[PDB]
Design a binder for this molecule. Structure first.
Ligand SMILES: [Ca+2]
Ligand code: NA
Length: 259
């Protein structure tokens, strides 16, 4: 059931970090779970600092919400910022101080692929508006794995590329007219890129769309609430058909409706 985004619900807080290490971070579920994981498996990365390697894994939603991790993975290389995703059994993340995306297979704790995103700015060149070295933002939608970034050639405008999830080859690339540093974050639903206007406001909006199937850009005015005034991560999960976000220590989710 695909369509255009027409509504975002109120943010629901599922867990609150208890230390400054979790002021910003990323939390996610796999929209294509593979053994031994399930649709309930949740991963959480607290991303404050300069040597971020701990990935908290929870087998059950109850554990993610109330308990300790079931397992902690120590990444073999530090991770950059909040843009990572989990897809079909692998964590896809950006290496610290690099434009390299790394595929880390969770069940074997093995790096399976690495790829420099060609021409991508990194480490504060084309972050989202809050900073945080958010230059490179991975995304999963109904069609698979994507990466959101910018390049000098694009003059800081959002570029998005479809990625091969096995070897990280770029399969197709689109260039928008949206200055990446002018929006708070972005995500992809059914092949359409959406942006959020502000990371602090209770009265933000989903303010732009770019449809990769048609090439058409639109302006939107869909209300979006940053309940805690500092959203560092906003992603879409196509299995749950919900937004997952990290807002000033709080792991939150938003329902949506599509046309
Ligand atoms: Ca995002
Ligand atoms: Na992301």
């Amino acid at each position: 059931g695909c369509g255009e985004l027409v509504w975002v619900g109120e943010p629901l807080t599922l867990r609150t970090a208890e230390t400054i290490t979790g002021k910003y971070g990323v939390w996610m579920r796999d929209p294509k779970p593979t053994y031994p994981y399930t649709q309930e498996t949740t991963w959480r990365i607290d991303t404050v600092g300069t040597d971020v390697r701990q990935v908290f894994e929870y087998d059950l939603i109850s554990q993610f919400m109330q308990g300790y991790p079931s397992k902690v993975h120590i990444l073999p290389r530090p991770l950059e910022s909040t843009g990572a995703v989990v897809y079909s059994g692998s964590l896809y993340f950006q290496g610290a101080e690099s434009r390299t995306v790394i595929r880390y297979e969770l069940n074997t704790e093995t790096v399976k692929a690495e790829k420099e995103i060609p021409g991508a700015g990194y480490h504060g060149q084309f972050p989202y508006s809050w900073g945080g070295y958010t230059d490179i933002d991975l995304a999963v939608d109904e069609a698979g794995l994507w990466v959101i970034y910018s390049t000098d050639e694009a003059k800081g405008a959002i570029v998005l590329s479809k990625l091969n999830p096995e070897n990280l080859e770029l399969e197709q690339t689109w260039e928008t007219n949206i200055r990446k540093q002018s929006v708070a974050n972005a995500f992809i639903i059914c092949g359409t890129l959406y942006t959020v206007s502000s990371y602090t406001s209770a009265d933000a909006t989903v303010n732009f769309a770019y449809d990769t199937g048609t090439g058409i850009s639109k302006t939107l005015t869909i209300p979006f609430k940053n309940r805690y005034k500092y959203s560092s991560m906003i992603d879409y999960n196509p299995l749950e058909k919900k937004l997952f976000a990290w807002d000033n220590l709080n792991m939150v989710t938003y329902d949506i409706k599509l046309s």
